[PDB]
């Protein structure tokens, strides 16, 4: 179990021995870059439609 | 692993669900000896677990009653209905009641007695405690000798629409009290309060589909063998899956179209919102039978079955145990 | 009735655990979800430093950090318990903190059964898509293409129907998922190659292989090793292509592994946490293949040491690892290259106070002056402690017990806190407060294994004066201290039950009355009862002890023995008892709540009213003679009031729910009291499993209407991270149905007022005139209660 553990910053935690964060309440808002929408169509219907479309071609 | 350990584990975990309690035996039982009517035939507990259904079937009258239930106290009836009005029944008959997945304002009872007839009537449930509007519709549809399949789960999967397959159509009657569902874009009588008023106010859509017309249109406008096999002899239609999210239904249709007789299958997706829309989704071939089609359809639906939450499901009772509340009544 | 919910102490139990460069591309950050309290930290030379703490309108269930191509810093995908998936980014302009939502939208299906193991969320290593497991048989997949304006999530049927853990493998041309599901034969491992163009699964590589019976989690090793590691009780197996490695060391056998983390970026070292707070380092040994690649020759595990019971580990730079604890205080333990003389490679550095599961509590005023402080029972197994939560920010005195505390009830005559607790014995694993005491006694009744014992704690210094041990195989269920009948003294009544492996339900119990004389506790009398005494409460001087599915009233006779008076068998499981005056409130486990009454004229129980709705109650409190509050397993609060206005026998015996609220936490106990020095008429304290402590206060009709209007106006002027509507967040939600919250004013939202900008405050009351000073005054008055 020897150790050569990673060091991302050689100085981090070097002065440990020589308070909850302030709450964030936003007043302004920017338009959402995108929207997430679930697919309501039944997967069985999608499967059968795909099969029929493949057959038609 | 005992029940006390489960409670201790819940107190800290914060996760308490009925599933984790399945292992333990029932919590409350009943002898059903003293707490019984007198010729009642109990049908089972309610979805809410607050009533117990039953009927008598004394021509036949076929009364049905509710039964408020208590662990130790005797059952107290709440309601009494006819459920078969103006119908002189000269057959034994078979009753099976089932409630809607989400809506809990009514239940649908079915009757099963060369051509057959079926009695289906909805009955409003007692008010929890408007409190005045309670109704019960009646209707009869006769089926052809090749009697159609019967499957409550998909028939009542819609929140307020029940799909009736009459062997010539797939009428889907929707009833609400209070704005459109059938074409939002079978004769039914009115009852309730021992009166038959003219139809807050109730509603009846009764949107129909023509099987013969749909099949004729599909074969005319599809199918590889459009140059042969004109017309058909008989067919059977079974519902594969109903999609309340977008109001669509899947139906599997088998035919026996013909000096060349062969059996063929088909499928169509009917969209409730836009009425009669036979959007074909499969075309089979005629080969040199009904039971085989039923077996194939049941296997196909089973293969694609997705489990549904215990919150929504079409409970079916016919003739007791309440799994959710771990209640049991022994006959 | 109209009530007002406010949070006295925010939740302190860690639920989510992630690390990554979020605030900026050049600073390490540590994010902790807790319960609906997301906190952002940054690693610095002095140590972890707070940055911001956004309160999401939902229970954080999934947190993942991912950096799609062409992004300077990582994004944050968050899915609430109410299915509110939304990707967030942290953009700061100078000294202004801003957290925009990349994307947002509900992902609830409404036609699926929630999975037994809970919500699982993963993201492709290449960020090609986001995988969600929410229901049995369905695996929602969200494409991440940032070209169009819509993210069309689509479900793919899962034939397994019993999947437990799902992970995205590494170094595959196409996004594949490796998961462990369960079948009647046993558990198995299977792989699917997900396709977004075809929206269907594909036959994955290294076809399914059977796995151990207790396989519980899957870890996706990165390159150059690749493959997956399945961790199960007394079994660790690594599967990759033809190669298959397994190891079952003895050390792991003691306890199960519940959490994992990756130390080396190449996956050469992992940290595993056990239920007993053991820290294991998992090693992968590689060899130089003929071609010149890495093959993971062998596997091996080591015991680093012991830490607080972990729900998560997250390794930080310089060897220090943060231990996210749910049943105890979190830690910042650091690993040491050289072992300790005792044989521990891990030494703690800092401890974060965690109120943990608030199993039971009771306010006391031992300091006089009409000032009360909360005494609770935190911790689960070895973090069990009593937290003396006073009021200053709250100063908390943690008294470690090293054993699970069950109940607590303070007795004033002897000035001692009678407390139930249970340890685990094989004999004694570790020294516990029970093991060492000034005096100790063991039950002498003639009527691993857990030992239960009702031990008393001093009120001043909290040294355990005496530790009474119960009969073997006997469980301590409920505890009460009160005066009975005509006796001048006070007894310590404790309800206990007997457990045997043969039976799955209790069949024998005990009701023992204790008296703490001088420095010893003796048994004056005892009663044997068929069943388990779930709960007990003094009722008009009679012990209203509840047995399994029954309730009883006991009279303390002159012979100093308990004699039953009347019973009420119409119950499924009577687990909660709250009494006001001559009224009784029985909170059934699966039968919502019922109200009873005792008639002195007839001396018999007469059921009066009952709530017919189906609910799984966790605690019940009687706010007043009419309004009865209750909390259910779905993390919602509801108050039902007895209705006498309607002149109907059926209506009279009907309890209508006139209040609904989605608290968002599992409430364990209610107790009457307040923390402030002795508009709202009464206050009720409740403790949750997440350690949150809140107040519920009644409001007059006019004040409730005013506050409801103020909150509705405020919703417009306050933006929510993730774009989640407050009405939807607080709307009562459960599997059966979901309805908007009514009769409950979210005090947390109201308190936000008087903290928003002055123009915002004016816009809230722009046309109400009330100006702004009046609103500030009323908000400060409401705040002063807690
Ligand atoms: C007669 N075979 C059975 O009963 C088997 C197979 C069907 N089954 C289900 O799992 C199930 O049934 C429904 S249903 O719509 O209420 N009934 C129903 C649906 C579909 C078909 Cl194809 C048929 C046929 Cl054919 C007769 N009944 C059908 C819903 C579900 C989840 C019960 C066990």
Curated annotation (Swiss-Prot), chain A:
List of residues that carry Phosphoserine: 22
UniProt entry tagged with the keyword Transmembrane helix: no
Pathway connected to this protein: Protein modification; protein ubiquitination
Organism domain of life: Eukaryota
Alphabetical UniProt keywords: Acetylation, Phosphoprotein, Ubl conjugation pathway
GO biological process: positive regulation of proteasomal ubiquitin-dependent protein catabolic process; protein polyubiquitination
One Gene Ontology term, aspect cellular component: Cul4-RING E3 ubiquitin ligase complex
Keyword check for Transferase: no
Function: Functions as a component of numerous distinct DCX (DDB1-CUL4-X-box) E3 ubiquitin-protein ligase complexes which mediate the ubiquitination and subsequent proteasomal degradation of target proteins. In the DCX complexes, acts as a scaffolding subunit required to stabilize the complex.
Sequence similarity: Belongs to the DDA1 family.
Subunit structure: Component of numerous DCX (DDB1-CUL4-X-box) E3 ubiquitin-protein ligase complexes which consist of a core of DDB1, cullin-4 (CUL4A or CUL4B), DDA1 and RBX1. Component of the DCX(DCAF15) complex, also named CLR4(DCAF15) complex, composed of DCAF15, DDB1, cullin-4 (CUL4A or CUL4B), DDA1 and RBX1. Part of the DDD core complex containing DET1, DDA1 and DDB1; the DDD core complex recruits a specific UBE2E enzyme, such as UBE2E1, UBE2E2 UBE2E3, to form specific DDD-E2 complexes.
Protein name as it appears in the record: DET1- and DDB1-associated protein 1
Name of encoding gene: DDA1
From Swiss-Prot, chain B:
GO terms under cellular component: Cul4-RING E3 ubiquitin ligase complex
Residues binding Zn(2+), per UniProt: 130, 133
Alphabetical UniProt keywords: Immunity, Metal-binding, Phosphoprotein, Ubl conjugation pathway, Zinc
Pfam hit, one: DCAF15_WD40
Binding site for E7820: 150, 153-154
UniProt KW Hydrolase keyword: no
InterPro entries in the cross-refs: DCAF15, DCAF15_C, DCAF15_WD40
Activation/inhibition comment: Aryl sulfonamide anticancer drugs change the substrate specificity of DCAF15 by acting as a molecular glue that promotes binding between DCAF15 and weak affinity interactors, such as RBM39.
Pathway: Protein modification; protein ubiquitination
GO biological process, one term: protein polyubiquitination
Matches recorded under CDD domains: DCAF15-CTD, DCAF15-NTD
Taxonomic superkingdom: Eukaryota
GO molecular function: metal ion binding; small molecule binding
Purpose: Substrate-recognition component of the DCX(DCAF15) complex, a cullin-4-RING E3 ubiquitin-protein ligase complex that mediates ubiquitination and degradation of target proteins. The DCX(DCAF15) complex acts as a regulator of the natural killer (NK) cells effector functions, possibly by mediating ubiquitination and degradation of cohesin subunits SMC1A and SMC3. May play a role in the activation of antigen-presenting cells (APC) and their interaction with NK cells.
Subunit relationships: Component of the DCX(DCAF15) complex, also named CLR4(DCAF15) complex, composed of DCAF15, DDB1, cullin-4 (CUL4A or CUL4B), DDA1 and RBX1.
Record's protein name: DDB1- and CUL4-associated factor 15
Organism annotation: Homo sapiens
Curated annotation (Swiss-Prot), chain C:
Highest taxon in the source lineage: Eukaryota
Modified sites of kind N6-acetyllysine: 723
Pathway: Protein modification; protein ubiquitination
BP term (GO), one: DNA damage response
Listed GO MF terms: cullin family protein binding; damaged DNA binding; DNA binding; protein-containing complex binding; protein-macromolecule adaptor activity; ubiquitin ligase complex scaffold activity; WD40-repeat domain binding
Classification via Pfam families: Beta-prop_RSE1_1st, Beta-prop_RSE1_2nd, CPSF_A
Assigned keywords, A-Z: Acetylation, Biological rhythms, Cytoplasm, Disease variant, DNA damage, DNA repair, DNA-binding, Host-virus interaction, Intellectual disability, Isopeptide bond, Nucleus, Phosphoprotein, Repeat, Ubl conjugation, Ubl conjugation pathway
Region (WD repeat beta-propeller A): 12-355
The keyword DNA-binding appears for this protein: yes
Location(s) in or outside the cell: Cytoplasm; Nucleus
InterPro entries: Beta-prop_RSE1/DDB1/CPSF1_1st, Cleavage/polyA-sp_fac_asu_C, RSE1/DDB1/CFT1/CPSF1, WD40/YVTN_repeat-like_dom_sf, WD40_repeat_dom_sf
Cellular component, GO, one term: Cul4A-RING E3 ubiquitin ligase complex
Main location, first listed in the record: cytoplasm
Quaternary structure (record): Component of the UV-DDB complex which includes DDB1 and DDB2; the heterodimer dimerizes to give rise to a heterotetramer when bound to damaged DNA. The UV-DDB complex interacts with monoubiquitinated histone H2A and binds to XPC via the DDB2 subunit. Component of numerous DCX (DDB1-CUL4-X-box) E3 ubiquitin-protein ligase complexes which consist of a core of DDB1, CUL4A or CUL4B and RBX1. DDB1 may recruit specific substrate targeting subunits to the DCX complex. (Microbial infection) Interacts with Simian virus 5 protein V.
Domain notes: The core of the protein consists of three WD40 beta-propeller domains.
Annotated family: Belongs to the DDB1 family.
Protein name: DNA damage-binding protein 1
Gene label: DDB1
């Amino acid at each position: 179990f020897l150790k050569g553990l990673p060091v991302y910053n050689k100085s981090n935690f070097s002065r440990f021995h020589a308070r909850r964060p302030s709450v964030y309440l936003p007043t302004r808002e920017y338009p959402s870059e995108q929207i997430i929408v679930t697919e309501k169509t039944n997967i069985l219907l999608r499967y059968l439609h795909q099969q029929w479309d493949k057959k038609n071609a | 692993e005992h029940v006390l350990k489960q409670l201790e584990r819940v107190k800290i975990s914060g996760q308490l669900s009925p599933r984790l309690f399945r292992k333990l035996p029932p919590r409350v039982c009943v002898s059903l000896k003293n707490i019984v009517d007198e010729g009642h035939i109990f049908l089972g507990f309610s979805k809410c677990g607050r009533y117990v259904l039953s009927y008598t079937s004394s021509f036949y009258i076929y009364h049905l009653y509710w039964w408020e239930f208590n662990v130790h106290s005797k059952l107290k009836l709440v309601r009494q209905v006819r459920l078969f009005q103006d119908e002189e029944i000269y057959s034994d008959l078979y009753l099976t009641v089932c409630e809607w997945p989400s809506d809990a304002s009514k239940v649908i009872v079915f009757g099963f007695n060369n051509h057959r007839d079926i009695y289906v009537s909805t009955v409003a449930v007692p008010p929890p405690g408007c409190l005045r509007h309670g109704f019960m519709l009646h209707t009869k549809y006769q089926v052809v000798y090749p009697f159609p399949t019967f499957q409550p789960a998909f028939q009542l999967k819609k929140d307020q629409v029940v799909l009736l397959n009459t062997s010539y159509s797939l009428v889907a009657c929707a009833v609400s009290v209070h704005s459109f569902c059938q074409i939002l874009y079978v004769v039914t009588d009115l009852r309730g309060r021992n009166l038959r008023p003219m139809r807050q106010y109730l509603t009846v859509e009764q949107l129909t589909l023509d099987f013969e017309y749909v099949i004729n249109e599909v074969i005319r406008h599809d199918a590889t063998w459009g140059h042969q096999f004109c017309s058909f002899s008989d067919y059977d239609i079974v519902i594969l899956e109903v999609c309340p999210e977008t109001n669509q239904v899947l139906i599997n249709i088998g035919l026996l179209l013909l000096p060349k007789t062969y059996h063929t299958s088909l499928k169509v997706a009917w969209d409730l919102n836009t009425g009669i829309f036979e959007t074909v989704s499969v075309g089979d071939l005629t080969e040199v039978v009904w039971s085989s089609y039923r077996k194939s359809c049941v296997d196909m639906v089973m293969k694609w079955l997705v489990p549904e939450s215990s919150g929504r499901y079409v409970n079916r009772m016919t003739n007791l145990a309440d799994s959710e509340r771990y209640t049991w009544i022994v006959l | 009735s109209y009530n007002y919910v406010v949070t006295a102490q925010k939740p302190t139990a860690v639920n989510g655990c992630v690390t990554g460069h979020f605030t900026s591309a050049e600073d390490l950050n540590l994010l902790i979800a807790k319960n609906t309290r997301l906190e952002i930290y940054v690693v610095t030379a002095e140590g972890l430093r707070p940055v911001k703490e956004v309160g999401m309108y939902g229970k954080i269930a999934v947190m993942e950090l991912f950096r799609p191509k062409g992004e300077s810093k990582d994004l944050l995908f968050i899915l609430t318990a109410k299915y509110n998936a939304c990707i967030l980014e942290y953009k700061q302009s100078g000294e202004s903190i801003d957290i925009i939502t990349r994307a947002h939208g509900n992902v609830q299906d409404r036609i699926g059964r929630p999975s037994e193991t809970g919500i699982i969320g993963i993201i492709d290593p290449e960020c090609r898509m986001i995988g969600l497991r929410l229901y049995d048989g369905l695996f929602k997949v969200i494409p991440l293409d940032r070209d169009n304006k819509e993210l069309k999530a689509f479900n793919i049927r899962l034939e397994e129907l019993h999947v437990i853990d799902v992970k995205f493998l590494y170094g595959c041309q196409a996004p594949t998922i490796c998961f462990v599901y369960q079948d009647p034969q046993g558990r198995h491992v299977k792989t699917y190659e997900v396709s977004l163009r075809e929206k269907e699964f594909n036959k994955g590589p290294w076809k399914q292989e059977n796995v151990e019976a207790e396989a519980s989690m899957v870890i996706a090793v990165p390159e150059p090793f690749g493959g997956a590691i399945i961790i199960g009780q007394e079994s660790i197996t690594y599967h990759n292509g033809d190669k298959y490695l397994a190891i079952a060391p003895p050390i792991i056998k003691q306890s199960t592994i519940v959490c994992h983390n990756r130390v080396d970026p190449n996956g050469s070292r992992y940290l595993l946490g056990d239920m007993e707070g053991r820290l294991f380092m998992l090693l992968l040994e590689k060899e130089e293949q003929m071609d010149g690649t890495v093959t993971l020759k062998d596997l091996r595990v080591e015991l680093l040491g012991e830490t607080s019971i972990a729900e998560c580990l997250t390794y930080l730079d310089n060897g220090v690892v943060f231990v996210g604890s749910r049943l105890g205080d979190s830690q910042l333990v650091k690993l040491n290259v050289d072992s300790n003389e005792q044989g521990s490679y891990v030494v703690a550095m800092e401890t974060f106070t965690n109120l943990g599961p608030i199993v039971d509590m009771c306010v006391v005023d031992l300091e006089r002056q009409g000032q009360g402080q909360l005494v609770t029972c935190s911790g689960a197994f070895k973090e069990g402690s009593l937290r003396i939560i006073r009021n200053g920010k709250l100063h908390i005195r943690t008294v470690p017990l090293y054993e699970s505390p069950r109940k607590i009830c303070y007795q004033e005559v002897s000035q001692c806190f009678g407390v139930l607790s249970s340890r685990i014995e094989v004999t004694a694993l570790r020294p516990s407060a029970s093991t060492q005491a000034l005096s100790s006694s063991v039950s002498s009744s003639k009527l691993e294994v857990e030992v239960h014992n009702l031990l008393i704690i001093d009120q001043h210094t909290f040294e355990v004066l005496h530790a009474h041990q119960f009969l073997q195989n006997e469980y301590a269920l409920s505890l009460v201290s009160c005066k009975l009948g005509k006796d001048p003294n006070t007894y310590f009544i404790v309800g206990t039950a007997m457990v045997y492996p043969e039976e799955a339900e209790p069949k024998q119990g005990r009701i023992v009355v204790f008296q703490y004389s001088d420095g010893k506790l003796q048994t004056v009398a005892e009663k044997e009862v068929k069943g388990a005494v779930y709960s007990m409460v003094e009722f008009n001087g009679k012990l209203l002890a509840s047995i399994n599915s029954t309730v009883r009233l006991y009279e303390w006779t002159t012979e100093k023995e308990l004699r039953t008076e009347c019973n009420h068998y119409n119950n499924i499981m009577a687990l909660y008892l709250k009494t006001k005056g001559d009224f009784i409130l029985v909170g059934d486990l699966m039968r919502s709540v019922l109200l009873l009454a005792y008639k002195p004229m007839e001396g018999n129980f007469e059921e009066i009213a009952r709530d017919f709705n189906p609910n799984w109650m966790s605690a019940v409190e009687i706010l007043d003679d009419d309004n009865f509050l209750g909390a259910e397993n779905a993390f919602n609060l509801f108050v039902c009031q007895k209705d006498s206005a309607a002149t109907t026998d059926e209506e009279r015996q009907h309890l209508q729910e006139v209040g609904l609220f989605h608290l968002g936490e599992f409430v364990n106990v209610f107790c009457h009291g307040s923390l402030v020095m002795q508009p709202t008429q009464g206050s009720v304290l409740f403790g949750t499993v997440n350690g949150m402590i809140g107040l519920v206060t009644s409001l007059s009709e006019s004040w409730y209407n005013l506050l409801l209007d103020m909150q509705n106006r405020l919703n417009k002027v306050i933006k929510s991270v993730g774009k989640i509507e407050h009405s939807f967040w607080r709307s009562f939600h459960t599997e059966r149905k979901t309805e908007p919250a009514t009769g409950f004013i979210d005090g947390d939202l109201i308190e936000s007022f008087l903290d928003i900008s002055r123009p915002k405050m004016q816009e809230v009351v722009a046309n109400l005139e009330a100006t702004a000073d009046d609103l500030i005054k009323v908000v400060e008055e409401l705040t002063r209660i807690h």
